[PDB]
Structures are given as structure tokens and as C-alpha cells.
Point group: D2
Chain length 114, copies 4
């Protein structure tokens, strides 16, 4: 299922483990200074009708090495089978002063392959 | 700072602990006072924010499954903590539901929330 | 009730004419006063809304180019009109700027705006 | 290069004209299925390799049907060889205000000429 190593369109790598508790843990990454801790949740008892499995996770972009004062959340679903995929939409927020709060959040989409 | 209980306009509250390791752990109560409405929250925050008056970036996730219900969906909030006489967390959120591939175009809602401590 | 002059929280102002056509035309003054801050807007609205209490779906676009300035980007607002004496337009918006392909992942901001008449 | 006929990732077609004044005017076929489109684009884009920013709106009402909804697409045009439009979109339906929180969907679409 979801546990394993996933790659997106643009080279990022995420190694995740799905607990039976609905917990998601892993890293978004190779080299230490590019690795960040992730945490999230997923639906551990999805519908049995062909629907995907809902899930979400967060990465705060601060590690031992660097800090971009920002965090990304990904919301999407796992679709299993032949080529398993995770289709997501994401929000990136940066810490801003009150003056720039209007432009603090980027939106995008990502697809991961196992 | 972030550690505490937070309420929105609209009848929702959450209790959270901001760990020194950048972890966010807590429980989200969808309907204030309703015990079957409690869900695990887990997220991350910037544990060393800028000292230039900028807020503190964060995010969390709730999958809407608990002992009592399962809505087959998950919400993620992305935003920032703004300290003040009245502290706030300002967010944008994405709620994704499980769908078949054909209905994927309609699986994700977007909105915004503001919580006050 | 849509036709008229609207203001948001940030002190942007827009003036719209709502056509029976379902056309929305007018100008968006991101500032107040100056020609230099004035841009064309165009959009569309549901000109035969449900009469069950639900609001009126609408959308419009501004490209941030005028004869004084060009920010190489455009914003789209998607929302609905709630009529009556305390009329309001609640929106979510997307701002996209021109980028290279390599940099397209950071080209679009999302946010929300509330307008009052 | 924006003027023309564009096709998305399964079905939908649109025909648009890019006016000298920054206007986009056209027709969107969501498969009786034809609707008015209107928008704006950057008529004087940077010459540094950057795409052309744009946006357009469709309200889903024509003389045959009405879904009490409107979609806005925001994105950019990428010219040359494999010219395309990459967009993200917001779909808002009229709702009562108790149901406001669930009025707006968000997505992405890519168009080809």
C-alpha cells in the first residue's frame, strides 16, 4: 500500500511508513541537508468501491542544516494497483510580516510514483 | 506560544502541543462539546522563527476517521501563528475525499480558517 | 445588486457593471485615487440564480498590466454574491505570474477576499 | 500563439481570441455544452524565457442549462514547439451560507493546441 519510497515529477523523494493507527511518518529528501521530517494521517479503512485512500502530510522546512521559515501541506489520495500513485494538491506557507501576509501562500499539485 | 487551546468562529476547537522538535500533536474537536467529534491531529511548525515580526509557519493534518465515524477524507491546514494580545493562527485548508479516478476532478475543496487562542 | 462600487479589507476598490448577458465589466483600483493603479476587469456571473437562499456564483480576472505598469501576472477571483442591504461578495483567488518552466512550481499564490458595497 | 483552439487532458475544448488590448474572448465546450468565456492576459510579457500570465472565467449557464456555478482558471501560456497552457482552477457553486465552507473546489488542468 502506502508504505514505501515515492518519487515526484521533479526529483523529490519521500519515504513513508503508514501505521495501523492511521499515522504517516517519514522523511522528504539522500544527503542529510536535504532531508526533512514529515508527519501526516491517512484513512486506514477506505471505502471498498474503487475510491482512493485519502491522506495528508506536512513538512516544515527546517532541519539541522537549514530553515526556510515555511511549511508545506499536501492533501490528496492514494490510488493503488498496476501503477500506484499519490495525487496531491499542496499549500506552501511562509512566515511573513502583516504587510506581506496576502502573498504568504503558494498552491500547486504533485504526483508521486512508487 | 502555539501550545494551548484554539477556537474558530464556527464551532470547532483544538488542543495542541508544539514540541521543541517542531512537532505538533493534539486533538481536533469538530463540534465543540461533542465527544464523537474528536480526531487526532498531527503537524509540523518552524521551531526557530524569524525575529523580524514575521509569523511562525506551520501545518497540520486531520483524517476524518475516529472510533465512531469515517468520512473517507482528510483536511490539511497551512498557515502561520501570529502572536499578539489576541494570538491567532491564520490558515488556508484543503479537504480531499476519496473518489474514483473519474471523479477526481471534484475531490478537493479549498477554504480558509482563523483560530484564536 | 451586483452593479456598483465594492471595497475589500485591504482597501482595494472595484467598480462593476453586471450585464443581463451574464457579463461583468469594470475596473479594479488596487489603490484609491490614481490612474496608475487602475486595471481592467472582466468576468461572468450566473444571471439566473437559484431563489432558494443560495448565493450567486461569479468570477472575474484582472491582468496586472496598464499603461503605467506591468507586473507580468494576473489574478482570478471565484466566489459568490449574497444580496440585500448588507450585500457582500466572498471570494477565493489565484494569482499567477509569468515564470520559466523550471520555476513554475512557485508561480501561483492563493488567497481570499471579502468585498462590501 | 494564444489565439486558437485548445484541448484538455480528456475532452473539453476551448476557442479563444487574444485581443491587442489584453482581452481573451471565446467559447468553452465542456464536451448544448457551449459556454461564454472571458478573460485577461499579459499582452506585453517579459522576453526572458518566462511564460505569459493569464486568466479566464466561465459561468456555467447557457440558454440550455444552468449549474449555478463558475470556474476561474489562472495560469500561464508556454509557447514555441510544444505550446501549452498550464492552469489551476477554482470552481464555486452558489450555496446557502451554512454551506459556504464547501462551495469551492480547486484543481489543475493543462491545455494543448
Amino acid at each position: 500500500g502506502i508504505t514505501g519510497t515515492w518519487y515526484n515529477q521533479l526529483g523529490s523523494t519521500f519515504i513513508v511508513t503508514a501505521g495501523a493507527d492511521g499515522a504517516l511518518t517519514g522523511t522528504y529528501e539522500g544527503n542529510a541537508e536535504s532531508r526533512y521530517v514529515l508527519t501526516g494521517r491517512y484513512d486506514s479503512a477506505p471505502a471498498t468501491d474503487g475510491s482512493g485512500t485519502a491522506l495528508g502530510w506536512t513538512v516544515a522546512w527546517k532541519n539541522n542544516y537549514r530553515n526556510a521559515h515555511s511549511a508545506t501541506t499536501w492533501s490528496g489520495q492514494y490510488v493503488g494497483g498496476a501503477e500506484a500513485r499519490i495525487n496531491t494538491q499542496w499549500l506552501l506557507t511562509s512566515g511573513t510580516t502583516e504587510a506581506n501576509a496576502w502573498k504568504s501562500t503558494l498552491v500547486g499539485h504533485d504526483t508521486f510514483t512508487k
